[PDB]
Swiss-Prot record:
Its main location: secreted. Its EC number is 3.1.1.74, 3.1.1.101. The disulfide bond between Cys-240 and Cys-257 contributes not only to the thermodynamic stability but also to the kinetic stability of the enzyme. It is found in: Secreted. The active site is at A130, D175, H207. Is inhibited in vitro by diethyl pNP-phosphate (E600), but not by EDTA. Belongs to the AB hydrolase superfamily. Optimum pH is 8.5 with pNP-butyrate as substrate. Shows 70% of the maximal activity at pH 7.0 and pH 9.5. This is Leaf-branch compost cutinase. It comes from Unknown prokaryotic organism.
């Protein structure tokens, strides 16, 4: 028995819509925290259970609202999700990494009572869009206790990240901002061969696909987080032996499948 398992047995259909957990929100004002720009927490309500936590970063010039759908989506499948605002909307990837670190520490140590009651502080993960995805890669190198990292259409000028944290990268085939040939693909390639890694490429999608409801992003991000944050092997089936017409590519070293 897995004490971290949550929710009914999954179907792919179910992972393309909000899940079985009711979601509450808490707006973190900029003035209330140090080390990051506040943000929005999406968390389960109507439950006595605890769940893993995820800190998520938007990209350059964006605010937390650009990943509201995904914060809600993940929370509704059983996670405490803090989508940050950054100190400045212009902050670069390695600044966003520091701010994700501050946000995780905030969840663990000074988050509101109703949020903290729902969190298992031992089980944390990161995700982020674009420069926020570069930040995700960098904090994976800095914090080996993280359970998982999901860079979405990531951007970074550095290409090699030395992490043991399981990484699933989402690229967008037609991304012209963080082109996959220069960003997502090199990131995937250059992670250690011994780290569980997946690359999923959205067919004919733009850089901004992560900023609105997206079935593929939903399936893969929920599944990776479930597998690693919750040890929930019921989600292997969506990540192994993949054939998804929403994707123009799927690559892995298959370390997650057994």
């Amino acid at each position: 028995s897995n004490p971290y398992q949550r929710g009914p047995n999954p179907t792919r259909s179910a992972l393309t819509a909000d899940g079985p957990f009711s979601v509450a929100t808490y707006t973190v004002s900029r003035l209330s925290v140090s080390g990051f720009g506040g943000g929005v927490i999406y968390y389960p309500t109507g439950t006595s259970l605890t769940f893993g936590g995820i800190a998520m970063s938007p990209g350059y010039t964006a605010d937390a609202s650009s990943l509201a759908w995904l914060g809600r989506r993940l929370a509704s499948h059983g996670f405490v999700v803090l989508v940050i605002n950054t100190n400045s909307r212009f902050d670069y990837p390695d600044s966003r990494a520091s701010q994700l670190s501050a946000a995780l520490n905030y969840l663990r140590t000074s988050s509101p009572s109703a949020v903290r009651a729902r969190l298992d502080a031992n089980r944390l993960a990161v995700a982020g869009h674009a420069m926020g995805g570069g930040g995700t890669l960098r904090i994976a190198e800095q914090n080996p206790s993280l359970k998982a990292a999901v860079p979405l259409t990531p951007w970074h000028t550095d290409k090699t990240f030395n992490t043991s944290v399981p990484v699933l990268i989402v690229g967008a085939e037609a991304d012209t901002v963080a082109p996959v040939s220069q960003h997502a693909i090199p990131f995937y390639q250059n992670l250690p061969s011994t780290t569980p890694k997946v690359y999923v490429e959205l067919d004919n999608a733009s850089h901004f696909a992560p900023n609105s409801n997206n079935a593929a992003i939903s399936v893969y991000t929920i599944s990776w987080m479930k597998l690693w944050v919750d040890n929930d092997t019921r989600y292997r089936q969506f990540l192994c032996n993949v054939n998804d017409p929403a994707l123009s590519d799927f690559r892995t070293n298959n370390r997650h499948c057994q």
